[PDB]
Amino acid sequence: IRIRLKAFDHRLIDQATAEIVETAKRTGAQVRGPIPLPTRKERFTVLISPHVNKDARDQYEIRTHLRLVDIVEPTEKTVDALMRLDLAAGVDVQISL
Amino acid sequence: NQYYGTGRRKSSAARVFIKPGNGKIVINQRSLEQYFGRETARMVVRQPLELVDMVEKLDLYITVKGGGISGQAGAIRHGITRALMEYDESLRSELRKAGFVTRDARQVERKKVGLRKARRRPQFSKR
Amino acid sequence: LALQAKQYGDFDRYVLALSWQTGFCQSQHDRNRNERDECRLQTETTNKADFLTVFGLWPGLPKSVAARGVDERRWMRFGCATRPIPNLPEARASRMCSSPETGLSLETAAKLSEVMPGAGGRSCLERYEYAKFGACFGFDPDAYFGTMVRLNQEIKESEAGKFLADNYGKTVSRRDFDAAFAKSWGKENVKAVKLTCQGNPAYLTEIQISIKADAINAPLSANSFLPQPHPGNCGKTFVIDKAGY
Amino acid sequence: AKQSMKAREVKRVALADKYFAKRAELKAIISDVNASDEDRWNAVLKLQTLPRDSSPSRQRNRCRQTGRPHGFLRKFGLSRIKVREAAMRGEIPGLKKASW
Amino acid sequence: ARIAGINIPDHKHAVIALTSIYGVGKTRSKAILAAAGIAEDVKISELSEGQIDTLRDEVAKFVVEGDLRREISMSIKRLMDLGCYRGLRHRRGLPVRGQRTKTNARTRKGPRKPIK
Amino acid sequence: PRSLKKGPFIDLHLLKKVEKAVESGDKKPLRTWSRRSTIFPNMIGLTIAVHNGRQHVPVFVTDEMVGHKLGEFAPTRTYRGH
RNA sequence: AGGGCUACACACGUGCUACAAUGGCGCAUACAAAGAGAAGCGACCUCGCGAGAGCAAGCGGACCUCAUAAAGUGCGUCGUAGUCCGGAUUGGAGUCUGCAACUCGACUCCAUGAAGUCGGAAUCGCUAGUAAUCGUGGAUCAGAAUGCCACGGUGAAUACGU
Ligand SMILES: [Ca+2]
Ligand SMILES: [Mg+2]
């Protein structure tokens, strides 16, 4: 089983990882290493004056962070627990068999 | 017992392995004279060897990914000068005096708002 | 059981699909899409009609869903996974045997594996198909898959089925398919047919027949067809592909 | 934006996604080379009949706060102005000033 | 080196030379010198009367020179006599295909007419 | 121009009211805002006064006017010179 | 609903493409970065000279798709011509988006082949991976960049001095 973790904060994500790679160890299973992935950086430019003045801008950004964790030898026990976990708000997870 | 460097210039990265031998070179499963058309490139790649006359006393092996020609060519030179002063912690001082040991750093400047390029700014004629 | 519609049931027509297995297998080669173990076999037969298989059966686009800004093209392409509604879990064609098991009685699930060759094992075309169109509506799996087979055999038996059996390996024409088909059902319900050909020269790969919604359970007849103005890309002639390459 | 102008966008959305299928299939025959000249010719007359405001190309993305027709951003559904205003409060998760 | 009742350069590669014919561009030039299986790099001066004729033949397949010039002129007369928007653009001597005139448009209008 | 496969475009309203012109022979001019519509052969012989923005202007249709679009005969700007 | 903001004796500003041989054309062949995609990015196959069309894998993506970088390089040709330079203008024939491209779209093929031979007085940018020059992406967006915002390739000149 693979779970991909994704979020806007980096401290926040490096929690959920540690949380999951604690349970996986708990409910007897081998977890194949939290491996980080390229972080997408959507960028935006906007006129900051409400009229005229083209050369006056802000440059905004959203950094998305991706993490991947595997499940080597999925115990029957684990599959329920790693499914049943209330996980920090503002974090998307995608467990997929 | 093969000696290794990484080497970077602009956007290039060059991982290199040297071994004692008669003076062969491979870049990305290819020969020097093939991979690099431009003459400059060649000069640059071998000038660390040409310095410490091991031009034909060691046999080199390389791969490069990223950058253009003068980038890769440059990145390789740095790669060698790293390995070549690791096989021999001795040579450093000589290598260094030629200014091969430093990693260039010069990158392309970003484009900025209000400008046509990094620093070129649109005309306005007082004419 | 009878095939009836629970949640959602407001559509004009089922649309039965049929893969000319030889012609289907052929494309796979031409395009170089991987050798699936279904075609890897492709052993010959005595009757040259058992190549006419069921690829699927597909309910119409139910008015309710259509009223939320959904059109046939999307409907077909996603089915129950369509948004905003119905929006059920996604039936991947790339990871087939990951979709839920259907619950199929081996009475049907043998009958099916005679007319849907790559069903079960490491193929699960059954599973995927149920997700894509069955699930949403709330059908009886043993009935639904059942109702397919019923209709498949009916067509092999008809004048239509015979024509392919006859002109196997040979080039043909729509006209002589048109006759063939009509002689069973009528010169009223020809347009309900739509063909699909591939390659050069054209060889038939797929056949689709657009059956009225009320008449799905009760056997076929001159009043069990809904003609639609799309005849398909096949053109004036086409090969009835023989097995091989 | 004038209340009226905000409104038209609702009239226009509603129709667009009610006749959505009718248009699609009624278009589908038009572009079918291999179809009845009788059919397709009918269609051309039939599409032009059902109402203009029911076309998706007829609508205009307006900030869903102030109604502005210009300087829209899809990611937020807001004008450049309201995007900035909200950005600075921290009402847009993640978003923040950038340098490189 | 007389084709379509005009003199063709005889020191030019056939490809280039044949273009002097009004109504043949470069695509046609290539075709001609293959439909009439004549090489491209061959200069016109080093040919046979025979070669020049089979060539003369190919060119007759098209509508060219005089003929063409007439066709065009009919088409434009046709428009102006119809009086369509496109017609008047041709009369008043203005960009016929939607181009701006507030500025530029000097190829139709010709060089500048000052004020006063 | 419009793809060839999609056929020639005419607004229906106007298409209809040049059956009654051609069947039930009249001899009046017709009002129309249908500058889109291309001129069909049926339209040969009938004056039809197409809108230019403020006024309708008569276009006595002919053989030569076939395929073109009405509005291609109702100029919409006034210019004498400077 | 239709038209107008796209009007054109003219004046000014900001750009693009040129005027050629450090170049045009044909064949052959190297080396990037950054970014976008959900009912969206759309391969492979078939059709078409081409814009494209049909069919339909994969991908909510370090995996699939956009999407083959170009200048460069080798071999050939043109031989200093208003030219094999330039590509404006216009006729003919198409494609696609869209209820709909007459006024007023982008693109394609065939033909056409203008001004321009390096620009008076004035006047602007830039001190290093900068200027110069070459390609790539994105936002807006049904369709409609030579603009804007980003990304790499090649890569100078000269500062005595006040
Ligand atoms: Ca075969
Ligand atoms: Mg991405």
Ligand SMILES: [Mg+2]
């Ligand atoms: Mg500016």
Ligand SMILES: [Mg+2]
């Ligand atoms: Mg640059």
Ligand SMILES: [Mg+2]
């Ligand atoms: Mg108000």
Ligand SMILES: [Mg+2]
């Ligand atoms: Mg719009």
Ligand SMILES: [Mg+2]
């Ligand atoms: Mg041309």
Ligand SMILES: [Mg+2]
């Ligand atoms: Mg209006």
Ligand SMILES: [Mg+2]
């Ligand atoms: Mg304006």
Ligand SMILES: [Mg+2]
């Ligand atoms: Mg320039």
Ligand SMILES: [Mg+2]
């Ligand atoms: Mg040229």
Ligand SMILES: [Mg+2]
């Ligand atoms: Mg885009």
Ligand SMILES: [Mg+2]
């Ligand atoms: Mg082709």
Ligand SMILES: [Mg+2]
């Ligand atoms: Mg400075």
Ligand SMILES: [Mg+2]
């Ligand atoms: Mg550029």
